[PDB]
Amino acid sequence: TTAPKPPSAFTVEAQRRVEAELPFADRADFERADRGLIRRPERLLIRNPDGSVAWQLGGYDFLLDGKPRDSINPSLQRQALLNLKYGLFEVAEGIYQVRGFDLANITFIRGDSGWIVVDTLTTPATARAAYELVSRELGERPIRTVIYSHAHADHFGGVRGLVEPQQVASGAVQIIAPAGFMEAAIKENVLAGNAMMRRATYQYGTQLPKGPQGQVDMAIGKGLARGPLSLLAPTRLIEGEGEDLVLDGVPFTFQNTPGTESPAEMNIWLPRQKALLMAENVVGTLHNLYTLRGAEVRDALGWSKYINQALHRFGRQAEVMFAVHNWPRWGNAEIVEVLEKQRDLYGYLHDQTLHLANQGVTIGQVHNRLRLPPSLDQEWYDRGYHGSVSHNARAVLNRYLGYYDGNPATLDPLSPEDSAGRYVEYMGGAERLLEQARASYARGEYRWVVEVVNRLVFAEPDNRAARELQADALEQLGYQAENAGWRNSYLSAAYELRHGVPRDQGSADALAAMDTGLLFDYLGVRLDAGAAEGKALSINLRLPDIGENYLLELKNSHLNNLRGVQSEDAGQTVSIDRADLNRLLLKEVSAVRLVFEGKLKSSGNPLLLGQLFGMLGDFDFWFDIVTPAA
Amino acid sequence: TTAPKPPSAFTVEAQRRVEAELPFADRADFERADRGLIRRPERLLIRNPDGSVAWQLGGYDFLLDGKPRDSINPSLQRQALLNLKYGLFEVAEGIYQVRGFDLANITFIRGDSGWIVVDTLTTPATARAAYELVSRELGERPIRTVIYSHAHADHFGGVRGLVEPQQVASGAVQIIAPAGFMEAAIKENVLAGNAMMRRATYQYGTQLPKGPQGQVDMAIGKGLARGPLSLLAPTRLIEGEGEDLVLDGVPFTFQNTPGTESPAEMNIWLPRQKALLMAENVVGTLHNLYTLRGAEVRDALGWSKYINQALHRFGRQAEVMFAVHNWPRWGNAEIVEVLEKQRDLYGYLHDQTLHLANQGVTIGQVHNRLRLPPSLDQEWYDRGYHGSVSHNARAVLNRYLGYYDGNPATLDPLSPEDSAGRYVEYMGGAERLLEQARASYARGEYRWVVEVVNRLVFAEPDNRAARELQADALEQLGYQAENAGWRNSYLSAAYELRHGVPRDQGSADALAAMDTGLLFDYLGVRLDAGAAEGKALSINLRLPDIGENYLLELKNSHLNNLRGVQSEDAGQTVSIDRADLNRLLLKEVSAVRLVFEGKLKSSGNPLLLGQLFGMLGDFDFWFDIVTPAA
Ligand SMILES: [Zn+2]
Structure with missing residues (x-):
């Protein structure tokens, strides 16, 4: 149900x-x-x-x-x-x-x-x-x-x-x-x-x-x-x-x-x-x-x-x-x-x-083994409500030693959806796996049941029996979970497994505060390598209302933004204010209009900045987590 | 063999x-x-x-x-x-x-x-x-x-x-x-x-x-x-x-x-x-x-x-x-x-x-999907010899988002040795898992075989058939491995689970350079919680050859060093130089001579520093990686 x-x-x-x-x-x-x-x-x-x-x-x-x-x-x-x-x-x-x-x-x-x-x-x-x-x-x-x-x-x-x-x-x-x-x-x-x-x-x-x-x-x-x-x-x-x-x-x-x-x-x-x-x-x-x-x-x-x-x-x-x-x-x-x-x-x-x-002790190992001392264990302000002993412990281990546990078995693993196929066959087909997983669900072995059935869930992305078993296996861990994030996570996951992902669904002064360099590093993240590949260009920017002068370069499917220096054998030169470039990127105004207002001046080829913004992509907010890509 | x-x-x-x-x-x-x-x-x-x-x-x-x-x-x-x-x-x-x-x-x-x-x-x-x-x-x-x-x-x-x-x-x-x-x-x-x-x-x-x-x-x-x-x-x-x-x-x-x-x-x-x-x-x-x-x-x-x-x-x-x-x-x-x-x-x-x-894309996926562009991929200095696109890519994701992939199935997993038994039982257990892994090994599903057999390896630590097979699967990846660390690791692992782990086996300048704060943090790391617990003390150090003044506190099974401060209702006061506190820790000399020589001044109970150093443990260098604790 x-x-x-x-x-x-x-x-x-x-x-x-x-x-x-x-x-x-x-x-x-x-x-x-x-x-x-x-x-x-x-x-x-x-x-x-x-x-x-x-x-x-x-x-x-x-x-x-x-x-x-x-x-x-x-x-x-x-x-x-x-x-x-x-x-x-x-x-x-x-x-x-x-x-x-x-x-x-x-x-x-x-x-x-x-x-x-x-x-x-x-x-x-x-x-x-x-x-x-x-x-x-x-x-x-x-x-x-x-x-x-x-x-x-x-x-x-x-x-x-x-x-x-x-x-x-x-x-x-x-x-x-x-x-x-x-x-x-x-x-x-x-x-x-x-x-x-x-x-x-x-x-x-x-x-x-x-x-x-x-x-x-x-x-x-x-x-x-x-x-x-x-x-x-x-x-x-x-x-x-x-x-x-x-x-x-x-x-x-x-x-x-x-x-x-x-x-x-x-x-x-x-x-x-x-x-x-x-x-x-x-x-x-x-x-x-x-x-x-x-x-x-x-x-x-x-x-x-x-x-x-x-x-x-x-x-x-x-x-x-x-x-x-x-x-x-x-x-x-x-x-x-x-x-x-x-x-x-x-x-x-x-x-x-x-x-x-x-x-x-591995990054897998530790959270199960590290237990608090009674003097700390036994006061309220030390309980894992926001943080948790478990995930804070492996965070610390991760900070010092990174994600890799040490064993080369875990060094170049397959993506769980590609290995999911095998994990199912090995077990016993899809439905044999189910009734022993469901046997271990009757045992109270919940945090095992979640790990194992999750493999079938990725193998069989529309298998109702797998999704809603995993759901009430997770949601039971959510009930007894002391940590709020853990509870909310386990319950939000179960809700999504059962009822699908939402089909149906920034702030100015943050972006205004956002440094010009960092903004353009975010533009470089947004870049689509498909459009990118093979092309190369060089745009100068002049931003007078902040007085900072950048040089944009694109080679080898990568955008490069450099403050306050700019070569004169570049492809295009652009002159535009900061507050209205934000407006442009916030999608409050069009570029052509900015030109006719008299605050977007361009020399050399006028088309490069246009193509670059064409090479920029965007990210679907509602991507899947507990399943593969639908 | x-x-x-x-x-x-x-x-x-x-x-x-x-x-x-x-x-x-x-x-x-x-x-x-x-x-x-x-x-x-x-x-x-x-x-x-x-x-x-x-x-x-x-x-x-x-x-x-x-x-x-x-x-x-x-x-x-x-x-x-x-x-x-x-x-x-x-x-x-x-x-x-x-x-x-x-x-x-x-x-x-x-x-x-x-x-x-x-x-x-x-x-x-x-x-x-x-x-x-x-x-x-x-x-x-x-x-x-x-x-x-x-x-x-x-x-x-x-x-x-x-x-x-x-x-x-x-x-x-x-x-x-x-x-x-x-x-x-x-x-x-x-x-x-x-x-x-x-x-x-x-x-x-x-x-x-x-x-x-x-x-x-x-x-x-x-x-x-x-x-x-x-x-x-x-x-x-x-x-x-x-x-x-x-x-x-x-x-x-x-x-x-x-x-x-x-x-x-x-x-x-x-x-x-x-x-x-x-x-x-x-x-x-x-x-x-x-x-x-x-x-x-x-x-x-x-x-x-x-x-x-x-x-x-x-x-x-x-x-x-x-x-x-x-x-x-x-x-x-x-x-x-x-x-x-x-x-x-x-x-x-x-x-x-x-x-x-x-x-x-999760931490368990990115390496499979991220592929370099031709311009970079095809030149020698861009090849994954020391680093590798794979493990570097997960590192970047790990930096920004940590280890947690997103799925709560992977939130509170069992330690692989505890979940190992069940992974064996319910593929059908030990030997029927083996031949289908062998079947996979005959295909050239090597980087699958290493992941799956490793579960049996942790379930059955001394099961030759599992460890030898895993070794061959591991080393054959190491043969193909372009990365040097990957080669060396896959092979080192294979050697260890074949021939066991070597039964039979610091710097001065580094330790002299090592800050007094940092040293004393490393001492706090070395602390044994077993001995510690319930106990509480307050040692008060003077270090004149560097001119720094530290206060040591122990409550709740934790050691706390603190420079430039020391309380005068403390437990015990000590005066000792750096250079010879190094020679003490390095085990070049005993404390008793260091007293009679005339460089160890102690006020108040003088037993606390001795007890604290008793609470300190040590770490075995040669611990198991590819097997559980023997
Ligand atoms: Zn807050």
């Missing part, structure tokens, strides 16, 4: 073990999550300018229940309720935080005559709503200082919700960020963008229903708010290892931690109330060293060090700690213990992975 | 396709390789001070034939037999190179009154041997400038063979290197060293005999010379993007290319002779973006543009090009097209991998 099955007896008993060993007599996190609530809006609906849904939490009503459901992991079910502790919160003399608007939090710190703000959610609407609440609840104050904690969309993404560019241009509003902020913001999210996003749909569960048979939590969040993406340039940068500043008469102490959530990130220390804002490093869960989305593997060793530096600099004198995702801690003894265990967590994760790896 | 089998009818057929499509007509590389020979010693051996072999070439006599052997790839033979053109070579007025004394080359540049040297090779023996040859061939001149091209052992490894610390300390000898050299030099082959080196045994073929049914070449050189490792610190660093300098009345122009072969690396331009030294960027082959030994993936994008910048600054005026591994090129028209294609090669790899990846 094409509909979610109930949990198996093995699945329920697995949920019993999670509740058995792992200690949840201690619900103190709830006690800390509520506490200091100012006022909780009873209905939450946030709306976009175009009219669509940005954010809504009535889809999660079913968790208010306070009753265990064995289609969800009871540890994840905790973290789900604790992220339903939404509303506006006291921390501080002068320190308040809005929460449950959006995946991230937003911090409001009262300057003697205005607001100082950390981070802007994910999209303008969520930021608007938060600012209107803060304004309505504790008096209307103008925002004067905006702090990007680090380069990630959920934190900078709703900046024009709060402020207009003219307010920054007048010098009446500050924007502060850790050095290298712009660099980090983009460069990731770009050249492998289509793949990451399409992969992400599994991780987040954009497909998913919002029920006990579906999405429940995003672990640092309920989920990601969904609208446009804003970004404004940092006026000030926190260079070096950190800086102590005064802004609207409030003392701040920034501490750079490059390499942790992000390549540019910093922790904030507020002295006259002894509050420590630990950024995305220290949060209510084990974080991703390697997001399943697709990313460069993050440095867990430097992550641990920078927590340890943060402990000795601040932890002693800090009596309240809080973060950009999730919810604060009070009493310095609790804070110190947390920071110690968080430091040692990522450290243990790094050191013991490499310890095992050095005894020849 | 347990001996190498001759090639199959499919292997020979494959070797004759290699003859067919590749342009073997043009053997120009041979007359370039021989070009400028001063004298070729008839009989080379190089010895160590201890008395062992450092380097020979009498093992490769079989390739001086010129007659095709289908147990080897004909393109690999070609590259092998080109790398046998050893001896001392002229390049231009005042530019000389020694090749075939080690994996690398060593360059000698005529100053008006002394030598200027680039690279010092694997070990002191080989370097000294080269300097003696240069002396008695063209006159004994003193070396007074040493240039490390980049941070890699095959280039800096034999520095002590040329110069003493005497001569550097006086200021009579210069050591020049690109900025970030040393740090680059170490951190990489450290924390995952044991793993990296044991894996390397396959890649290099340290076990392998040296025949047509064994090791043939190392692609960028015959193999690696094998003695001690020497390292002397850089006196001056090339900072920024580059620097133009004069040494002994000779003009140089250094161009930094950080992120290629190495995190710290530079191309050298000699304007008088008009020659271009391109370091490890442009060589006689496609270079690794990911060494199979195990490393973080190299940035191919930056590689391509730093080649393009070199082309435009030098290539126009360049008249002879040469490199640190292999052999030069003459005539600027050739140079330019080489640099064009080399640039466009790495750029095509990077771009079209991501093109395919953004179009939905």
Whole structure:
């Protein structure tokens, strides 16, 4: 059947073990999550300018229940309720935080005559709503200082919700960020963008229903708010290892931690109330060293060090700690213990992975073998909600040693769809394979069943019996999975196997921020080698509104973009502004018109730039994952 | 049987396709390789001070034939037999190179009154041997400038063979290197060293005999010379993007290319002779973006543009090009097209991998589908000798998106040894799996056979029939394998599962160079969680011969070093020098003498440091790869 099955007896008993060993007599996190609530809006609906849904939490009503459901992991079910502790919160003399608007939090710190703000959610609407609440609840104050904690969309993404560019241009509003902020913001999210996003749909569960048979939590969040993406340039940068500043008469102490959530990130220390804002490093869960989305593997060793530096600099004198995702801690003894265990967590994760790896434990091997120590294992903020011990362990191994396990058997393997054919024949034809796979499904051997049947799934891309067996084999792992990404992934996969892929379905300031070089590297990725092959050309560009001068070269099916140098024996010369070249590529205007406006001047052959853009292709967003290409 | 089998009818057929499509007509590389020979010693051996072999070439006599052997790839033979053109070579007025004394080359540049040297090779023996040859061939001149091209052992490894610390300390000898050299030099082959080196045994073929049914070449050189490792610190660093300098009345122009072969690396331009030294960027082959030994993936994008910048600054005026591994090129028209294609090669790899990846292609597919264009595919320096299109392509995908293919079937798989049993049972189990694999082996489905039989190999670790068959299947791929690492690996694997794993079997300068932080991280890696756990301590180090102050902490089975800080309610304080803490760790001396000698000061409980070092474990070098743990 094409509909979610109930949990198996093995699945329920697995949920019993999670509740058995792992200690949840201690619900103190709830006690800390509520506490200091100012006022909780009873209905939450946030709306976009175009009219669509940005954010809504009535889809999660079913968790208010306070009753265990064995289609969800009871540890994840905790973290789900604790992220339903939404509303506006006291921390501080002068320190308040809005929460449950959006995946991230937003911090409001009262300057003697205005607001100082950390981070802007994910999209303008969520930021608007938060600012209107803060304004309505504790008096209307103008925002004067905006702090990007680090380069990630959920934190900078709703900046024009709060402020207009003219307010920054007048010098009446500050924007502060850790050095290298712009660099980090983009460069990731770009050249492998289509793949990451399409992969992400599994991780987040954009497909998913919002029920006990579906999405429940995003672990640092309920989920990601969904609208446009804003970004404004940092006026000030926190260079070096950190800086102590005064802004609207409030003392701040920034501490750079490059390499942790992000390549540019910093922790904030507020002295006259002894509050420590630990950024995305220290949060209510084990974080991703390697997001399943697709990313460069993050440095867990430097992550641990920078927590340890943060402990000795601040932890002693800090009596309240809080973060950009999730919810604060009070009493310095609790804070110190947390920071110690968080430091040692990522450290243990790094050191013991490499310890095992050095005894020849493979990238296949390790996740099954590496198990946490009781002291770390047995606190909540160390549970694999966002990150996971498993996939973080093989991320670390992958970072140091790459993908290749060591065995040459796995060195030049066939594509799984080409080897799928054989794997089926060998077994016993298609249907013998089925009933022993289905026998091992009755055993409770689920994470075997997924690996094996997946081979038949690729051999037989339309075999209903294979697809919907694999589906409820996967979806059962999704039920008992503690990790949110894992759950959402297993369920999004099953949903797609059963009901097919969606047949039926960027942001300006990101592209404006995007460096000319990087943009043209993305154009070179987009290039079609079929058109390419054999041809060769040389285009000069002049971009006067940024003042940068590029040289484009095409030989051997590859495009090459070179700043600020250009040969005069080239094929064509082009003169065009940056902001309108964006407009051209964003597909808001045509080129011919740009010519008649008097801002596209060309000498030499006029046709090369035309052909080149003809050689550029595009990528189908909805490509298959759990099946071969249809 | 347990001996190498001759090639199959499919292997020979494959070797004759290699003859067919590749342009073997043009053997120009041979007359370039021989070009400028001063004298070729008839009989080379190089010895160590201890008395062992450092380097020979009498093992490769079989390739001086010129007659095709289908147990080897004909393109690999070609590259092998080109790398046998050893001896001392002229390049231009005042530019000389020694090749075939080690994996690398060593360059000698005529100053008006002394030598200027680039690279010092694997070990002191080989370097000294080269300097003696240069002396008695063209006159004994003193070396007074040493240039490390980049941070890699095959280039800096034999520095002590040329110069003493005497001569550097006086200021009579210069050591020049690109900025970030040393740090680059170490951190990489450290924390995952044991793993990296044991894996390397396959890649290099340290076990392998040296025949047509064994090791043939190392692609960028015959193999690696094998003695001690020497390292002397850089006196001056090339900072920024580059620097133009004069040494002994000779003009140089250094161009930094950080992120290629190495995190710290530079191309050298000699304007008088008009020659271009391109370091490890442009060589006689496609270079690794990911060494199979195990490393973080190299940035191919930056590689391509730093080649393009070199082309435009030098290539126009360049008249002879040469490199640190292999052999030069003459005539600027050739140079330019080489640099064009080399640039466009790495750029095509990077771009079209991501093109395919953004179009939905997984890590398990890309290598099969990505195929080079004719212009690049057909030239010798673009052939996958050292690197390979296949494993480089997956490395790029792995860099941007990590190991996870996308399918949750592959998310939480079993360790192959745990799933091995079931793969056997339910193909029908051990012997009926065997004959159908044999049936596949009779077709020439070799790279299938290796994957499937390997499951049985892990299920049944001592099953001769499985391991011998797998060996024959593996080695026959190694016969056809154009890539040298691939050949050496496939063969090394086959040898190991045939004859078992060898039952019967560090550097000072490196360890003195190794940062105190990094060292203590490696200690933290070496920690045994078993002993550790539950325990907690706080050691407090003073290191006066370097003047650095460290705090060691142990909680939650994890060790945390921290410089420039130390708490005065710690557990135990210690004062000890670097140099003798090295001699302690290296096991040159015991701690007790080091006390009585008068260099070990201890305050507070003095037992903690002793206990901590007790908690430290160690790693067996010879672990199993192609079998499970015996
Ligand atoms: Zn976030």
